[PDB]
Amino acid sequence: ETKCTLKSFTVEKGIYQTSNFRVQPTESIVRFPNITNLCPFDEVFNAT
Amino acid sequence: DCTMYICGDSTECSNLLLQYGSFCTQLKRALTGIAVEQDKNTQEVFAQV
Amino acid sequence: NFNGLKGTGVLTESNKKFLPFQQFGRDIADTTDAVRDPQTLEILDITPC
Ligand SMILES: *[C@@H]1O[C@H](CO)[C@@H](O[C@@H]2O[C@H](CO)[C@@H](O)[C@H](O)[C@H]2NC(C)=O)[C@H](O)[C@H]1NC(C)=O
Ligand SMILES: *[C@@H]1O[C@H](CO)[C@@H](O)[C@H](O)[C@H]1NC(C)=O
């Protein structure tokens, strides 16, 4: 990486910065709110 | 660190930054020029012996 | 995504006390750092990657 972030092939004696170790994303999930909003479909399907 | 400040650790913004190119290497080769003079300022003020 | 707050990060556990009418958390950068899950009533954490 010090051959890659410096854009050369021969480097000299020293200390260089390349990148960091931030944690990369793996997945995409979702948690929304409770519903408590059921339609009145009991009489729609279970009327006598 | 450049990508981190400009882009919030994402992927779509990290790829787009390369289109601008070397706007940032110029930035971290200046704040590494400053951050080596500070180690040089103290070495010539206190370390004469 | 918690209640429509899009973001990417590592979700850990915290113990911050939030008032019931006080949902989102901010910081010096005016960014969402500590949130609360909509289905339950637990404050998750202030933890990026
Ligand atoms: C959505 O609400 C229902 C009740 O209307 C929750 O069901 C129960 O809720 C009580 C009180 O919160 C809990 O003590 C029980 O353990 C719950 N039972 C089950 C089977 O969940 C339901 O939990 C709520 N949804 C969420 C995601 O919390
Ligand atoms: C109608 O009755 C059946 C039989 O118990 C049940 O399975 C179904 O859930 C009922 N319909 C509704 C909308 O609850």
In chain C, what residues touch A27 (CB-CB under 8 Å)? none
Which residue in C20, C17, C18, C11 sits closest to C45, CA to CA?
Answer: C11
Q: How many CA atoms lie within 13 A of C46 on its CB side?
A: 12
Distance between CA B16 and CA B7 in Å, rounded? 10
Whole-number Å distance between alpha carbons of C21 and A38: 25
A34's CB contacts (< 8 A; 6+ apart) are C38, C39
Alpha carbon distance A35, A47 (integer Å): 25
Q: What is the distance in A from the centroid of ligand 1 to the CA of C35?
A: 20
Contact C43, C16 (CB under 8 A): yes
* Nominal resolution (angstroms): 3.6
Q: Which residues of B touch A25 (CB under 8 A)?
A: 10-11
The Cβ of residue C2 has, within 10 Å, a number of other Cβ atoms equal to: 20
CA distance C18 to A34: 20
C37 to chain A, closest Cα gap in Å: 7
Tokens of B29: 């080769």
Determine the 3-state secondary structure of C5 from DSSP. strand
C39 Cα–ligand 1 center, Å? 9
| Listed residue (A6, A10, A8) closest to A19, CA to CA | A6
